[PDB]
Design a protein around this ligand. Structure first.
Ligand SMILES: */C=C\C1=C(C)C(=O)N/C1=C\c1[nH]c(/C=C2\N=C(C[C@H]3NC(=O)C(C(*)=C)=C3C)C(C)=C2CCC(=O)O)c(CCC(=O)O)c1C
Ligand SMILES: */C=C\C1=C(C)C(=O)N/C1=C\c1[nH]c(/C=C2\N=C(C[C@H]3NC(=O)C(C(*)=C)=C3C)C(C)=C2CCC(=O)O)c(CCC(=O)O)c1C
Ligand SMILES: *[C@@H](C)[C@H]1/C(=C/c2[nH]c(/C=C3N=C(/C=C4\NC(=O)C(CC)=C4C)C(C)=C\3CCC(=O)O)c(CCC(=O)O)c2C)NC(=O)[C@@H]1C
Ligand SMILES: *[C@@H](C)[C@H]1/C(=C/c2[nH]c(/C=C3N=C(/C=C4\NC(=O)C(CC)=C4C)C(C)=C\3CCC(=O)O)c(CCC(=O)O)c2C)NC(=O)[C@@H]1C
Ligand SMILES: *[C@@H](C)[C@H]1/C(=C/c2[nH]c(/C=C3N=C(/C=C4\NC(=O)C(CC)=C4C)C(C)=C\3CCC(=O)O)c(CCC(=O)O)c2C)NC(=O)[C@@H]1C
Ligand SMILES: *[C@@H](C)[C@H]1/C(=C/c2[nH]c(/C=C3N=C(/C=C4\NC(=O)C(CC)=C4C)C(C)=C\3CCC(=O)O)c(CCC(=O)O)c2C)NC(=O)[C@@H]1C
Ligand SMILES: *[C@H](C)[C@H]1/C(=C/c2[nH]c(/C=C3N=C(/C=C4\NC(=O)C(CC)=C4C)C(C)=C\3CCC(=O)O)c(CCC(=O)O)c2C)NC(=O)[C@@H]1C
Ligand SMILES: *[C@H](C)[C@H]1/C(=C/c2[nH]c(/C=C3N=C(/C=C4\NC(=O)C(CC)=C4C)C(C)=C\3CCC(=O)O)c(CCC(=O)O)c2C)NC(=O)[C@@H]1C
Lengths: 176, 63, 176, 63
């Protein structure tokens, strides 16, 4: 666990590379260790798809968000929203990789409601974007998406899909 | 408190067990007992994507 | 077009940035200058979409291509094919930027048929991938794709669309 | 004869007339008379994309 903590705390772009005995140990101390790698890949390999579809669905269900002065009116605010969606998505993916949400809660979520409140970022749209990412991640982990598929040994990843959904629930609770 | 640097953990999963390698496939870690497999994590700033922002604004009504 | 020829000849990652008076001059030197900028953006901003859909269509119409000893069997060969499709698409996009096909013909296409023939890269699949990219680019230039839209001033771009198709036709003729 | 370096001209179009800029928006060229507009061209190696290769193999039957 210390390899990831080092590069996350430094946050300088230095990478931790986990293979061999280090990788065998990583998977040994989490549940469903191999399936968990596939579940993490199902998220990160689809990051742009997940983010664009969630923010697009947030707007198509509530087009007031893209009306003049709306939450994502103008390219700068739309881009900041897509950026936030990916930031959140990636902390969830790291939570699923590590088997806990501590970095998600401490580095990403702590004080996030207050930040959005002061900025006027609408919590309803924010929650909806998270909810769509949650449902999309669920399909990808289960390999039930309509178009993009993942080829892995056949089995049941419901537990990992629930664990991922729980990390999204931590975001929804922090967004309020 | 949360960070304010727009940085997030970028997780990359590698499965090169089909044998297709590139320069980055060796030297990053030991592969003992886990040939072809690696997890990479690094902190990266998530940038604005003008192209995607413009695309969503123009296309959001199309599922 | 001497700035472009500089960095194309050098082929070292050096960029030509074209703004201000240089860009005004460029847009008057080529035909339909402002529409041509939009037509080019319609290609390059959708490059991953165009390439993935064309190679996917090539395979879905001939799944032998992904069977053992097929043209894109194994991740290695599929990746090389996706690479070639983007290479070709990007030389087409540069032809549309500059208004001529010289770089496409000289640097990308000259001897390409012999290269593919010596390797046994199947010409029918290659031709179909190009054909699908041609049709996809045509819709994007005309902003008639079903999902991804481009917001531009209303008007006609059928001269630019025809020109782009002509560059794809030179690819089709070259790889026979 | 054709090149063999896998390099292609990468064309990038910029329209920042809405006013949103960033570090890369200045000092690349003069904007005299064409505010917020730029064409960029460079030669870059087109790399292999394992994620997309795997995706097409698994998903090509889905339009
Ligand atoms: C990159 C996109 C996807 C590919 C490719 C693929 O194969 N699946 C993709 C995405 C995906 N989306 C969803 C679920 C939802 N997407 C929504 C947004 C969409 N719906 C709209 O009405 C509009 C605006 C017109 C949109 C842009 C919505 C609202 C959902 C449902 C969320 C919910 O259930 O509450 C999924 C999961 C469901 C599925 O497997 O089809 C995926 C995988
Ligand atoms: C990134 C994809 C696209 C988005 C987003 C969008 O809005 N349009 C996109 C792509 C696009 N595709 C085409 C045309 C074709 N695509 C084909 C591949 C597809 N068809 C199949 O049968 C299979 C395999 C099951 C596929 C993966 C094919 C064959 C075509 C037709 C080519 C031809 O005309 O000869 C277009 C152009 C037509 C349109 O505007 O819808 C676009 C824009
Ligand atoms: C839910 C995620 C889906 C699913 C997964 C599933 N995977 C396996 C088995 C394996 N997966 C891997 C993958 C990796 N291990 C690594 O270390 C890395 C790199 C970081 C990767 C990508 C491995 C090695 C296995 C073991 C089997 C093998 O050698 O291929 C299973 C089988 C059960 C198990 O726990 O081993 C399953 C079920 N399957 C689905 O149907 C879901 C969509
Ligand atoms: C076919 C491609 C579609 C289309 C295009 C179209 N565009 C315009 C007008 C303009 N387009 C630009 C765009 C740029 N100029 C630049 O220098 C750059 C950066 C390199 C870009 C992106 C500009 C500046 C104009 C002029 C008007 C303006 O200031 O906005 C037109 C109008 C006619 C004309 O020739 O100007 C058209 C028709 N329109 C469609 O409907 C097609 C899908
Ligand atoms: C605001 C945050 C919006 C946004 C901007 C954004 N732009 C870039 C990158 C570039 N922008 C230009 C544009 C110009 N450079 C110039 O010199 C001129 C005048 C002649 C213009 C119009 C260029 C050339 C680049 C690329 C820089 C390069 O090649 O080195 C970025 C990327 C980061 C960067 O600053 O390089 C960003 C984020 N993006 C959005 O999503 C907002 C809507
Ligand atoms: C063949 C052309 C296929 C392909 C390969 C490809 N791989 C990468 C990048 C990486 N691969 C690894 C994997 C490992 N490194 C190791 O040391 C080990 C042993 C423990 C493994 C399993 C890693 C870590 C990378 C990233 C490198 C980095 O972080 O800097 C690439 C990208 C280019 C490169 O060489 O880095 C490529 C092209 N890609 C395909 O599409 C083919 C299927
Ligand atoms: C998208 C679904 C919604 C949305 C997003 C939106 N967010 C901002 C601005 C900020 N977002 C953050 C978030 C973080 N910064 C970090 O460093 C981290 C952790 C590493 C996180 C989670 C912050 C700090 C800001 C403020 C500073 C900044 O702009 O970067 C905006 C811009 C708001 C504005 O009006 O300026 C937007 C638009 N907006 C929506 O409407 C959606 C609901
Ligand atoms: C995809 C639609 C089709 C396909 C492609 C495929 N191509 C190769 C190999 C090569 N492709 C080129 C092409 C270029 N190299 C360049 O530098 C340029 C211009 C800058 C071009 C156009 C070359 C030179 C090769 C050979 C060298 C190399 O591999 O890099 C392959 C690999 C073939 C093999 O057997 O190893 C593939 C798979 N294959 C299909 O089936 C589609 C029809």
């Amino acid at each position: 666990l210390d390899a990831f903590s080092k590069v996350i705390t430094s946050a300088d772009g230095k990478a931790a590379y986990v293979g061999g005995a280090d990788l065998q140990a990583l998977k040994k101390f989490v549940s469903d260790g191999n399936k968990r790698m596939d579940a993490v890949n199902a998220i990160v390999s689809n990051a742009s798809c997940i983010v664009s579809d969630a923010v697009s669905g947030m707007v198509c269900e509530n087009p007031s968000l893209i009306a003049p002065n709306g939450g994502v009116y103008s390219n700068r605010k739309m881009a900041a929203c897509l950026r936030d969606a990916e930031i959140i998505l990636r902390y969830v993916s790291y939570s699923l990789l590590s088997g806990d949400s501590s970095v998600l809660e401490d580095r990403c979520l702590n004080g996030l409601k207050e930040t959005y409140s002061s900025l006027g970022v609408p919590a309803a749209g924010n929650a909806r974007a998270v909810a769509i990412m949650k449902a999309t991640v669920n399909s990808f982990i289960n390999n039930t998406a309509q178009q993009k598929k993942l080829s892995v040994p056949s089995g049941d990843c419901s537990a990992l899909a629930s664990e991922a959904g729980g990390y999204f629930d931590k975001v929804t609770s922090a967004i309020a | 408190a949360m960070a304010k640097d727009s940085k997030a953990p970028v997780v990359e999963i590698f499965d090169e067990r089909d044998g297709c390698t590139s320069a980055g496939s060796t030297g990053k870690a030991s592969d003992a007992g886990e040939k072809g497999l690696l997890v990479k994590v690094s902190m990266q700033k998530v940038g604005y994507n003008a192209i995607m922002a413009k695309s969503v604004a123009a296309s959001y009504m199309n599922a």
